[model samples]
Target chain A: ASYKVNIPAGPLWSNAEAQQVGPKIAAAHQGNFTGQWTTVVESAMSVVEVELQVENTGIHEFKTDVLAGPLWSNDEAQKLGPQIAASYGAEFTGQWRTIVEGVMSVIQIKYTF
Target chain B: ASYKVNIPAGPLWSNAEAQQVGPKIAAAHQGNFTGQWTTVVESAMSVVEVELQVENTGIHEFKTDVLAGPLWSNDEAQKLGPQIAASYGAEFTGQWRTIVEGVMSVIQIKYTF
Candidate 1:
């Protein structure tokens, strides 16, 4: 199965983004083979733009977006990667990317089962 | 007027934390003397705990919590200070602090009119 979830630009710190997207991801996995999900966070002026895509796979892949401050660095991303993965029932893949910075930073975390 | 809002321990990236707190802060400031707000973010076991305290004052004070990654530094905080303050309708006071680190990091922002 394949799923796509799009969350329009919204305050990164607001619940609207997650509330609108989290359950959709959970629903995509319900009663199906474990799957993997990928997310892209973009800086859109005063807000954030997020897109999540998922597919069923032999192992589960989960991702989370951690907001970045101007001081955000690779060190902080590496340190929090595993923790974010663990929260989503996956293991950190030791992979992360910074999509944007400044007024808002979008760091994407990749994890696997 | 004085008000306090408590948000239980929750996933730092989950919208539950912000959704439960943002509105309370807005309501407290509606039709009042522009005021100031302060927040304390604490790492609680696997989750993040937040407490927001606000009061009426001659000038408005606005604050937001930016989740920190392990690599978060004073430089990043300094860069984002003014931007965040502007978002909340205030000017960055150039004052920020880290309340906790590890599984989750809580950074408190301070701004004023």
Candidate 2:
């Protein structure tokens, strides 16, 4: 029993947009969360992504995309990988970033239980 | 076998820090990644966290903390949950956010796979 929220970042919105738009989005779900944060960019871009964590609520993560766009987020790694590889001019084979470092996704569950 | 990266945001570091500190952090332990970003806040805070995605690389996500203060990042969500729950003045019991919207922790594998 959990819910999902999408936090968009970039130029199209402002800090006030985050404050204003955020709660409206939050209100719709009617779920309870322990932590909530929406990050806004100064220079701006098409969009941004944020994480919302809820306890004893939902199970899966799936929601809407920002702006006049497609799902914006995709599940089919095949569909996305080529695009990513193209973006960096490399061939991807389910391998992660070679140069990047640090820790990877620390799922919402980790934060929950 | 993928890798993980953590991005730290906010005033504790500068934009340059994100730029400089971000990649240097990425290079460690020899992992691959698709998207990498470290956000910075106008107002300084004790710390900030960023997610790292390593595709076709690893399954598990575990790593270090940023500051000298604590593990910064914890595994036993149990140990960490109570600490963060207190900061926000809420009783978190695995339910996500009510006030917070958007998605939470789209693990590195999501991007990697």
Candidate 3:
């Protein structure tokens, strides 16, 4: 089964700011989801090569586009991606459609099959 | 003719710190390299899409790998890559042998076919 869920575009977050605190966010999720799942915020999607899942305990990949940055360092997208997944009500099996645009680094995510 | 010259591994640099100063470094080298060769420092290697050349111009691609971090954001690697080439005598072909490991972001380059 596959369903597309849009994570509603949110405010832009600076990659420079994210790099400073991104690790904390990853560490924040270090022991959640049955104490096995792990997550980390990245500046670029190309850096990510794993699938997004709730119960997922392995690699995760993301589809990303940056408007003016050298890479996908969307802090809002990274934080919101999982939050949106958690809203799906169950483990997800699909892919990400991420776009970081504008001067503010606005982010939009669409989960699909 | 082909040569595999290693840039002689140098001290490691933090990606967190790199993210902040990386852009400045790129901009520093922007006007150089015949004023046509463009450059940018990336936190991840996958993001680089061009070939490193001196007199030559156009897209540059890099081969990279990160040790512990989620991506390859080697500041020294990015800075030193070209410097090593500048000493190579002319435009270079081949690939990169990048590995950012240990407490430092040590870098090594291999200009080979």
Worst 10 residues of 2 chain A by lDDT: A64-73
lDDT of 3 by residue, A1-113 (tens): 11111110011145443333333222212211121111122221111011123232334322221111122445434533333233222122333332222212212222221
Tell me the spans in candidate 1 whose CA falls farther than 4 Å from its real position: A1-58, A62-71, A87-90, A111-113, B1-45, B50-113
The local lDDT score (0 to 100) that residue B93 gets in candidate 2 is 48
Please give the DockQ score of every candidate, comma-separated.
0.03, 0.04, 0.02
Please list the C-alpha lDDT of all candidates, in the order they appear. Answer: 0.33, 0.27, 0.24
lDDT of 2 by residue, B77-110 (tens): 3333322221111122432222123333211111
Clashing pairs in 1: A70-B76, A71-B76, A76-B70, A76-B71, B35-B61
Give candidate 3 regions above 4 Å deviation.
A1-113, B1-72, B92-95, B99-113
lDDT of 2: 0.27
TM per prediction = 0.26, 0.21, 0.14
lDDT of 3 by residue, B65-99 (tens): 11111223545344333333332221223234322
Maximum-lDDT candidate: 1
Interface RMSD of 1: 14.5
Candidate 1: what's its TM-score on chain B? 0.33
